[PDB]
Amino acid sequence: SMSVKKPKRDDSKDLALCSMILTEMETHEDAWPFLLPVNLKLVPGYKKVIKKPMDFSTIREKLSSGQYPNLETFALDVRLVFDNCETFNEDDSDIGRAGHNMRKYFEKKWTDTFKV
Numbered sequence: 522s523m524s525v526k527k528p529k530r531d532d533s534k535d536l537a538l539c540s541m542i543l544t545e546m547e548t549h550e551d552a553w554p555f556l557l558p559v560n561l562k563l564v565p566g567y568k569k570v571i572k573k574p575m576d577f578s579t580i581r582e583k584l585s586s587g588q589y590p591n592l593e594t595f596a597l598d599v600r601l602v603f604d605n606c607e608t609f610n611e612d613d614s615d616i617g618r619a620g621h622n623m624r625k626y627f628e629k630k631w632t633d634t635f636k637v
């Protein structure tokens with residue numbers, strides 16, 4: 522509360538570390554469905570169903586332009602990518618499988634990087 526500060530983690534390297542994690546995501550062989558925004562003019566249903574589209578290139582742009590206030594808002598957008606993917610794709614499809622794989626990949630790197 523007022524004048525009662527918790528000791529808080531050193532967040533000075535967060536931007537660099539999130540960029541490193543995003544780079545590993547971008548270079549994963551299963552990243553291809555997520556590299557660019559879904560084309561809302563070519564994919565029936567997507568605009569109406571997926572209320573907040575997100576993709577790696579959009580995350581990279583927001584990261585590079587100071588649009589994430591903190592590391593949690595970055596993680597929310599990454600997770601949004603895979604939550605959208607689950608909403609629109611069957612688990613037993615290539616993109617569906619890609620999404621689950623990429624989510625798993627992200628969450629381990631997230632834990633390994635920031636959860637001490």
Ligand SMILES: CNC(=O)C(C)(C)C
Binds near residue numbers: 554564567606609
């Ligand atoms: C991530 N891509 C998708 O979810 C499709 C709309 C199926 C192309």
